[PDB]
């Protein structure tokens, strides 16, 4: 075999085009989100602690910070830098958001939240220097945007334990993978039963979706040598 000629320059690591369904890659959908609007800011527990305490229905659900930090993990993970990561968001109104690789989200939660409200109404976010679409609101079912040969998995608690490294070597060669994560604070794991291949558990302790996807993507970056 040839010695596979060296790279005298570095490589750009293009992201994945929207029409490609060939490759193995990693997608995550932040399902069961709670991003409601109030007036014009999102509905949180910051100041709306009082109004949801008055109306007495699950103030601990109005938690867009969970989403913010989890997408921070996903966008900042090196799988996205090499361009092997892709994100969808799914929320209890049924809404789907495509989150592309080539974006920085503001680390600032308030600019982030205003960005999200503008997304929720205009249904698109364009670049500043570039004309391309970055954050784009799209439709159900997610199967239409999910490639066919994948292991359509979610994380739960009562499911048995396999090792994430074991599963990422179990995965097929061409076969990409997405992970369905219920980013709510408290709630049952029924959110993706109509889509899920199988529920797994990675650790004995109860976990956040952020550390879930973080440990997960780091293990995949190990098994795919990033």
């Amino acid at each position: 075999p040839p010695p596979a000629l060296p790279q005298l320059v570095a490589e750009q690591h293009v992201p994945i085009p929207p029409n490609d369904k060939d490759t193995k890659r990693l997608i995550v959908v932040l399902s069961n989100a709670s991003l409601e609007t109030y007036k014009y800011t999102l509905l949180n527990s910051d100041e709306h602690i009082g109004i949801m305490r008055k109306m007495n229905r699950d103030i601990s659900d109005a938690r867009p910070d969970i989403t913010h930090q989890c997408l921070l993990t996903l966008l900042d993970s090196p799988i996205n830098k090499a361009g092997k990561l892709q994100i969808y968001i799914q929320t209890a109104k049924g809404v789907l958001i495509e989150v592309s690789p080539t974006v920085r989200i503001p680390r600032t939660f308030k600019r982030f939240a205003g960005l999200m409200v503008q997304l929720l109404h205009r249904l698109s976010i364009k670049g500043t220097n570039t004309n391309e679409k970055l954050l784009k609101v799209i439709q159900n079912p997610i199967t239409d945007h999910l490639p066919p040969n994948c292991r359509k998995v979610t994380l739960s608690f009562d499911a048995p334990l396999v090792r994430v490294r074991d599963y990422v070597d179990t995965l097929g060669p061409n076969e990409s993978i997405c992970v369905f994560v219920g980013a709510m604070a408290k709630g049952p794991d029924n959110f993706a039963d109509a889509y899920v291949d199988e529920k797994i558990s990675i650790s004995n302790y109860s976990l956040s979706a952020s550390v879930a996807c973080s440990k997960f993507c780091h293990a995949c970056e190990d098994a795919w040598d990033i």
Partner: peptide
Amino acid sequence: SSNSYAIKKKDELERVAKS
């Protein structure tokens, strides 16, 4: 071969039927 979208989809239908 798996290089066809039609085969990829039909196999996905078969595998979810088995699932």
